[PDB]
């Protein structure tokens, strides 16, 4: 019996399996394809899904939703903090932790996050027992790729909690590439934008695929924006429409509230088909009917800085991940807002025209890549970059990785201290900034250096790769033709494919510490006679 691949989301969740080579989305009991991630407790029972989010405007102190914004932090976290503003529901410090706080049967019972979200993982798990008619176990289940460790093993703690043996953790918008074959598509290396707006969050992430192996290069977005937003502006609106045409403020009544919620999520969805959309309330204050209409353009109106604003965080991850918006292969359109013709336009339009990845349902790609990779789980170019080392034990790469072979690339160094008498050089392997993080090749002297001023010896290092992958790695001094040279075998299986990720993972972990230290040495090339990594 395969495993399931599941998407537990802010606001809803998505379950996958991959059986007789098509990826199935797995409907729940009333019909859906996605599931609300909340978990209402009441006087008699437990609810969980559709009933937990259709009893929410009766029961609202005691139904849960959000628990992904609370997994994994601290009980001051500055989020957390914030967060609670917004939400009926109560949490509570138990030891710095939080816990969210319930009437369950008469006595109150306390949650943590892990245990919120486990009950959301019991209910997809049982959606995927009843469609594939036997229990399910294993599972591979995804987070924001900017989730820390700690996030992480909460997540996996609520799917051990559930019954679910967790295969593996990966990130969403990985699953998202995986799910459109991204990682199939041959060439060099490839630059994946992931543009992920659902209905609370909103996630970029750019991503480089080469030779089946990602690596998370840049992450931005914006927690607390997503379609409930375009809904809100419209709810505004037509308050004030109403304000305007029958001088009668609707707010202070609360069912009248959610039924124009309900009628603006509604006409929301026709403006993604239709340029006008209807607005039909029978009796919806002081019996007044309100019967009119939105065109898709007052809807643009109503949400203007908001759909332009999502090419900021389109900006931000381009510069930090130092590309060029001219540099991306793909994009990858996840979130159900993402049907928005506008939100589509703005970023064809900022990304000179290139066509969208968006054949696949965008609310359940996710799900869809993370069942691809459960049924994996269940059953050229250069592996790591090359380089030396250089004063302070500094990674200096000349051959990145992914780099085509054969190829040959060279570079010129220069001493440290002054009259220098020879060079120490030290290959390695690895995406780390420091070389101690990294795996030592071979070593060899250059020596007989002309004594001279710091940063006037001429060092020229060569790295070259035939076409079987031995690497030849020579220095010559500049000022006299003297040379040497270090071969490295290239042992079959040396690396797995996963030992590649780890060291890919490692570095995107770190990147932030490795940022600073790179910046820290004002090296610039320069080579010591010693090993950085041995010295007291
Ligand atoms: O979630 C949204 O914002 C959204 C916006 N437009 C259309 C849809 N839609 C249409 C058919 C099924 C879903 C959803
Ligand atoms: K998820």
Redo the contacts with the bound molecule.
Sequence with gaps: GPAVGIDLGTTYSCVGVFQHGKVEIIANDQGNRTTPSYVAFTDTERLIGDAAKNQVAMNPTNTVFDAKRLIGRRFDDAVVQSDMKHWPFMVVNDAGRPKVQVEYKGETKSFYPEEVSSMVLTKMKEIAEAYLGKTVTNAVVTVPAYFNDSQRQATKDAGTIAGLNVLRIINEPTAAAIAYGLDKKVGAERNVLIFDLG?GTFDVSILTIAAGIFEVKSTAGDTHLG?EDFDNRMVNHFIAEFKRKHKKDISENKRAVRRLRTACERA??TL?SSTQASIEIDSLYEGIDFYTSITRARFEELNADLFRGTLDPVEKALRDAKLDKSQIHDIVLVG??T??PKIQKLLQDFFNGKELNKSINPDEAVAYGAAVQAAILSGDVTPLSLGIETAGGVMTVLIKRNTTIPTKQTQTFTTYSDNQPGVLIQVYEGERAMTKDNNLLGKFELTGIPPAPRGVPQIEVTFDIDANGILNVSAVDKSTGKENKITITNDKGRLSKEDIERMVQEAEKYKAEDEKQRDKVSSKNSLESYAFNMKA
């Design positions: 209905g379609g929301k969805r993604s159900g807002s049907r928005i």
